[PDB]
Amino acid sequence: SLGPQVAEGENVFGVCHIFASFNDTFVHVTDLSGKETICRVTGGMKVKADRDESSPYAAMLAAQDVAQRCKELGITALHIKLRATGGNRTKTPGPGAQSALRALARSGMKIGRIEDVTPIPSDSTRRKGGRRGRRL
RNA sequence: GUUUUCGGAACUGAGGCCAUGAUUAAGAGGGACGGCCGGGGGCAUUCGUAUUGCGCCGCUAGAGGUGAAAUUCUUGGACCG
């Protein structure tokens, strides 16, 4: 918890993978390589209602919790790596990333380079469902 | 009583004469030639993510899914990286 780094002159970088879908949000922060984690909280950690766990407020609360964890641990700067569901399902990010980014910026956590890293397919396998789709 | 004018017809050779003898190349068709064009066809080769499973590492109690839930998988480490 104690380290010989310079606070005023420079800063410490990590990366944070924000995976947001239409069912859940994932605010995961690691080191610069991504091999070694820092803290991982999700939209199920803050709200116990299973209706809206991909809600913006749950993602906001999880982002404030992981920002407090990185502040008490000693991480000052973050590189945002945004992610959707990917694959053959969808490409639009979920309704938690917009609140999660603003909650990460509002807490005093400095933001470096932001990027969308989602799995894009070059015509992968068949999507779940019939030929006529899911009729509702 | 020979052999003639008393004469009915197939075939071949030499020369001359013919206005010597073949209508066109269809905004018909076929074919040749030259420069190309094309997710046209067959065979071989090569690449790109994505999906699933498995191996290892890290921290965590939820993850998936729905209009809403459960069946489903989870401290024997799920999900995410």
Shape: elongated
Radius of gyration (CA) equals 17 Å
Number of strands: 6
| Sheet with most strands | 6 strands, mixed
How are the elements arranged and paired?
Blueprint: E1 13-20, E2 25-30, E3 37-42, H1 56-73, E4 77-83, H2 97-106, E5 110-111, E6 115-116
Parallel strand pairs: 1-4, 4-5, 4-6
Antiparallel strand pairs: 1-2, 2-3
This protein binds one RNA strand of 81 nucleotides through strand 1, strand 2 and strand 3.
What does this structure look like?
This protein is an alpha/beta fold and about 140 residues long. The protein is about 20% helix and about 25% strand. The chain is built from two helices and six strands, in the order E-E-E-H-E-H-E-E. The chain has helices spanning about 55-75, 95-105; strands at about 15-20, 25-30, 35-40, 75-85, 110, 115. Strands 1, 2, 3, 4, 5 and 6 form a six-stranded mixed β-sheet that branches. Helix 1 (about 55-75) runs parallel beside helix 2 (about 95-105). It is elongated. The chain binds one RNA strand of 81 nucleotides through strand 1, strand 2 and strand 3. It is classed as ribosome. Keywords: HCV, ires, 40S, ribosome. Structure of the wt IRES eIF2-containing 48S initiation complex, closed conformation. Structure 12(wt). The protein: uS11. Organism: Oryctolagus cuniculus.
